[PDB]
Curated annotation (Swiss-Prot), chain A:
DNA-dependent RNA polymerase catalyzes the transcription of DNA into RNA using the four ribonucleoside triphosphates as substrates. Belongs to the RNA polymerase beta' chain family. RpoC2 subfamily. In plastids the minimal PEP RNA polymerase catalytic core is composed of four subunits: alpha, beta, beta', and beta''. When a (nuclear-encoded) sigma factor is associated with the core the holoenzyme is formed, which can initiate transcription. It comes from the Eukaryota. This is DNA-directed RNA polymerase subunit beta''. Signal peptide: none annotated. It comes from Nicotiana tabacum. It is found in: Plastid, Chloroplast.
Length: 28, 139, 53
């Protein structure tokens, strides 16, 4: 698939890594 | 002769039609033809001549741009010949105050016109194959 | 264990890394934009934002 086949119809008009989880004592 | 005509009300038309020696450099030619251009009121140049004068390689690169993922208009979806209209700012390197009209021609296929207040294109055609054995484009 | 209190936390290791990164960005921000332009012609989602972006 390429440009000949697909076209752009409409011209028309805080976030990040919070952390990494910690392993658990109560595995069950 | 140019001076005498202007005295008596004349308007000058420079149809360029560049000869072979003058196709070597943009720089040598712009200098040789300069006085004539500025004393001219109507000018006709071909598409290949206009590009020669300004950024010939830049125009060539443009016509070979084919978009990678998606087309931006339905026109680019159709694989047809280029008929770029030169924007008025592009031709500003070559305007002067006494120029009433400028015509750029692409065969009989397109004719572009530029005036102090307006711009545009006239669509045309060519059919040399209707008479295959008596076709000459010479005049 | 939750202390709602603050100012007793030292992420020294992280902080050191943070300074370290800051220098890195400075050094190659430019190189990185030039490289994108050369190898990637048009933006698609997932590729480096450049320009007005």
């Amino acid at each position: 698939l390429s440009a000949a086949n697909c076209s752009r119809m409409g011209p028309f008009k805080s976030l990040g890594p919070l952390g990494t989880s910690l392993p658990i004592e109560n595995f069950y | 002769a140019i001076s005498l005509s202007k005295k008596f009300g004349g308007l000058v038309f420079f149809d360029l039609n560049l000869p072979l020696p003058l196709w070597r450099s943009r720089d040598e030619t712009r200098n040789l033809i300069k006085e004539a251009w500025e004393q001219a009121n109507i000018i006709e140049v071909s598409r290949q001549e206009l590009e020669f004068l300004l950024d010939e390689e830049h125009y060539e690169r443009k016509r070979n741009y084919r978009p990678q993922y998606f087309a931006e208009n339905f026109e680019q979806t159709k694989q047809r010949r280029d008929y770029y209209h030169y924007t008025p700012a592009e031709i500003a390197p070559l305007w002067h105050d006494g120029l009433k009209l400028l015509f750029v021609t692409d065969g009989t296929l397109r004719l572009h016109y530029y005036s102090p207040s307006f711009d545009g294109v006239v669509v045309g055609t060519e059919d040399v194959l209707i008479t295959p054995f008596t076709c000459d484009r010479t005049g | 264990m939750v202390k709602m209190e603050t100012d007793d936390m030292g992420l020294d290791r992280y902080k050191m890394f943070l300074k370290q990164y800051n220098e890195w960005v400075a050094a190659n921000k430019d190189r990185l934009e030039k490289e994108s332009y050369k190898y990637d012609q048009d933006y698609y989602p997932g590729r480096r934002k450049r320009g007005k972006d």
